[PDB]
């Protein structure tokens, strides 16, 4: 009906007008008075050399020492990063995995991919082996991200345009978030784990309430598919890296884009983004085989992590902020300090 | 400088390393084929010869083949096609009888053009199956090729029409040097399609070995 189309157009115009009214000064104008962090020199302290294919995801344990990594050789490897020892190696039923999660308690890990199933594996069993605790099915597209809320609750994003909050005890979708129009590629949980942001292929990100399930706000501005999303440590902002070779920082309360991190040299898209412990550094993995450490406040390239011979696919920062792990499309993970 | 527990942990890590190495060696001896088509093209029959992604394992002359039919994956192909960067070959199935309408033949043509001229599948070879040759013959005897191809100069002969379609598909290749296209005419036929696949992947493996040595 034309009346619905006109109402939607006027509502979008009102949203744009309200956002413009709430904007008075760009974050760069306010921030430029502060001292730049200078050149950020980081060296490869450790190199994890166990995988045999492209590494697609990695996640840090909450103890900032154990990390789980997934590659398309059908293996989930739990590494002790301090000693480069392999704590665990789990054979996956489906070798096509694009996501990987570590439970905050450290008892479980999660995996998923082109098989449209989120597999939860129990790491702490009396039998002494890692076994599949539960397979969650109900997504009609590939699983792109999964994040543990606790030992019993997980939230998954899929290429079937929808997100789902599950219940591992029963394996049923407790909540379904359906607001996107393209494949959802990333997922970031808020520090309080009551909200989460999802970035999809319609060049938009959406903020969902976990408790009941609603798209509270929608953030646009990207020119292509958003591949990565990460919450600011404060929890009042987030950053999205997309295929148009740019990262963007949005603010929840302002409901607006705060900053754009881009450079004319960079023409390749971003595969992963993460923040430092204080939020001053925004780390972004690129397809040009390098990672860029941006000054999240001043939008300047504070440093470059150039140690990978292929596209950097996954990137994470420890909970204590001591190190950053990057996994790329070669079979190597690197720890930087 | 390592305590007893640290030494035992290192030993366990080395055992895990050995198991991973053995698993990777076993996996590297497997031919990975990416199966593609336009739905009713006839992928089901080809799979018969030998929710998300579907895997088919078979064996031929002591060679282990893994065929990955991503055919009920109705998402953005660009977001997951790079996962198959590195397969031995792409088996593309097209129905010769699907040139009637509902355009289908052109749909297969555009899908083949998109797959062949891809950044990831720059060096991967494509085994092209043109199946349902009997229904193609039956349709040709009654209706001409001109509905699908207005700029076609030929009679209602099976051989000439089939050859014209084959070259029409083979001209979609842009990188006609680094990638080779193998064409077979199929039809719910004798086991000759598995032999054709084996021959094509043998050629691809010879080329890959020559690349590895470095002469190429």
């Amino acid at each position: 009906l034309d009346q619905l189309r006109q109402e939607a157009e006027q509502l979008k115009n009102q949203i744009r007008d309200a956002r413009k009214a709430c904007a008075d000064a760009t974050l760069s104008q306010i921030t430029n008075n502060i001292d730049p962090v200078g050149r950020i020199q980081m060296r490869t302290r450790r190199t994890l050399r166990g995988h045999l294919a492209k590494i697609y995801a990695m996640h840090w344990g909450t103890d900032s020492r154990l990390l789980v990594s997934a590659s398309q050789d059908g293996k989930l490897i739990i590494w002790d990063s301090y000693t480069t020892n392999k704590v665990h190696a789990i054979p996956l039923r489906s070798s096509w995995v694009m996501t990987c999660a570590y439970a905050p308690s450290g008892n479980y890990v999660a995996c998923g991919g082109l098989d449209n199933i989120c597999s939860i594996y129990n790491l702490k069993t009396r039998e002494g082996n890692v076994r599949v605790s539960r397979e969650l099915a109900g997504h009609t597209g590939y699983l792109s991200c999964c994040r543990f809320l606790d030992d019993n609750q997980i939230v998954t994003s899929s290429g079937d345009t929808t997100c789902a909050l599950w219940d591992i005890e029963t394996g049923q979708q407790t909540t379904t978030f359906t607001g996107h129009t393209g494949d959802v590629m990333s997922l970031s949980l808020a520090p309080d784990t009551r909200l989460f942001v999802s970035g999809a292929c319609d060049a938009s990100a959406k903020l969902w309430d976990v408790r009941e399930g609603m798209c509270r706000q929608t953030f646009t501005g990207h020119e292509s598919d958003i591949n990565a999303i990460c919450f600011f440590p404060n929890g009042n902002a987030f950053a999205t890296g997309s295929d148009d070779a740019t990262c963007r920082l949005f603010d929840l309360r302002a409901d607006q884009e705060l900053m754009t991190y881009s450079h004319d040299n960079i023409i390749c898209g971003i595969t992963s983004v993460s923040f430092s412990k204080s939020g001053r550094l925004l780390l972004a993995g690129y397809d040009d085989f390098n990672c860029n450490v941006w000054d999240a406040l001043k939008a300047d390239r504070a440093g470059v992590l150039a140690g990978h011979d292929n596209r950097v696919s996954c990137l994470g920062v420890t909970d204590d902020g001591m190190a950053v792990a990057t996994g790329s499309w070669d079979s190597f993970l690197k720890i930087w300090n | 400088t390592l305590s007893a527990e640290d030494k035992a942990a290192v030993e366990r890590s080395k055992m895990i390393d050995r198991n991973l190495r053995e698993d990777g060696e076993k996996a590297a001896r497997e031919v990975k084929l990416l199966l593609l088509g336009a739905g009713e093209s006839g992928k089901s029959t080809i799979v018969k010869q030998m929710t998300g992604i579907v895997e088919t394992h078979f064996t031929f002359k002591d060679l282990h083949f893994k065929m990955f039919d991503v055919g009920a994956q109705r998402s953005e192909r660009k977001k997951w096609i790079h996962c198959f960067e590195g397969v031995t070959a792409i088996i593309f199935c097209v129905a010769l009888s699907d040139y009637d309408l509902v355009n289908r033949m052109h749909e297969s043509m555009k899908l083949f053009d998109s797959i062949c001229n891809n950044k990831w599948f720059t060096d991967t070879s494509i085994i092209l199956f043109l199946n349902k040759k009997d229904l193609f013959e039956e349709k040709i005897k009654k209706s001409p090729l001109t509905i699908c191809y207005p700029e076609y100069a030929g009679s209602n002969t099976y051989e000439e029409a089939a050859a014209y379609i084959q070259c029409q598909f083979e001209d979609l290749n842009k990188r006609k040097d680094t990638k080779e296209i193998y064409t077979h005419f199929t039809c719910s036929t004798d086991t000759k399609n598995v032999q054709f696949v084996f021959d094509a992947v043998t050629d691809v493996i010879i080329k890959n070995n020559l690349k590895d040595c470095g002469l190429f």
Partner: single-chain antibody, 233 residues
Framework: DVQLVESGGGLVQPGGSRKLSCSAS????????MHWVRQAPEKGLEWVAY????????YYADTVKGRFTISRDDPKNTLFLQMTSLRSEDTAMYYC??????????????WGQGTTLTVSSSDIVMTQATSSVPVTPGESVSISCRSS???????????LYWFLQRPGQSPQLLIY???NLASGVPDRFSGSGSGTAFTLTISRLEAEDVGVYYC?????????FGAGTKLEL
């Protein structure tokens, strides 16, 4: 059901060549390093031998080196201890402890039932001082254990283990690495201390908590135990 069953004990003449077997059922036996730990009748536990996962590493006590041999049959899920030139000092009950080693693991977590064996007729010293203290339900008791060498390693781990042996039962792991409470142990047990001085505290002691408490070091082989403190009343 992570049970370990022991067989091959009995009466052996001196100089005999009796062999003990240990059947494992309910866990991935191939991934566990396995120990033989003996206990003389009126004595405490004493570590005998250890075989790693994959049989790549083997250790023996100085009292059994050259006469004992430990081995595994992983497909059969069995652990063997072949003992030759048996002497009267080898009269003991033998246990078949399992221990897996990775970051955060809890070694020595499960013990077998033990096989009795009766023969006819640089090491770290761990001192447990007190040998018997009477207790009453509801109270809190602190069991002390001193070490000759500092068990605190350069990596931050203090390799001290606390085991409890109830009357007429097999020892069970209470604490591993001096602070971590083993799975299934009630929270009333706690472990603290520093290098060469450790203490296991039982707060609000009750029934089924009486027995002999042993402190063991895993800093280096051979592993050594304390004499044990008995809890009665």
């Amino acid at each position: 059901d992570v049970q370990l069953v022991e067989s091959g004990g009995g009466l052996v003449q001196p100089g005999g060549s009796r062999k003990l077997s240990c059947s494992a059922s309910g866990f991935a036996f191939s991934s566990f390093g396995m120990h033989w730990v003996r206990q003389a009748p009126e004595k405490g536990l004493e570590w005998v031998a250890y075989i790693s996962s994959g049989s790549g590493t083997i250790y023996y006590a100085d009292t059994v080196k050259g006469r004992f041999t430990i081995s595994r049959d992983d497909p059969k899920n069995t652990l063997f201890l072949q003992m030759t030139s048996l002497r009267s000092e080898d009269t003991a009950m033998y246990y078949c402890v399992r221990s897996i080693y990775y970051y955060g693991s809890s070694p020595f977590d499960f013990w077998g039932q033990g096989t009795t064996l009766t023969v006819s007729s640089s090491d770290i010293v761990m001192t447990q001082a007190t040998s018997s203290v009477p207790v009453t339900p509801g109270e809190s008791v602190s069991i002390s254990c001193r070490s000759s060498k500092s068990l605190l390693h350069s990596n931050g781990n203090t390799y001290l283990y606390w085991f409890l042996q109830r009357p007429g039962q097999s020892p069970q792991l209470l604490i591993y690495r001096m602070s971590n409470l083993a799975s299934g142990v009630p929270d009333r047990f706690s472990g603290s201390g520093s290098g060469t001085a450790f203490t296991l505290t039982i707060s609000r002691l009750e029934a089924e908590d009486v027995g002999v408490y042993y402190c063991m070091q895993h800093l280096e082989y051979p592993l050594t135990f304390g004499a044990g403190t008995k809890l009665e009343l």
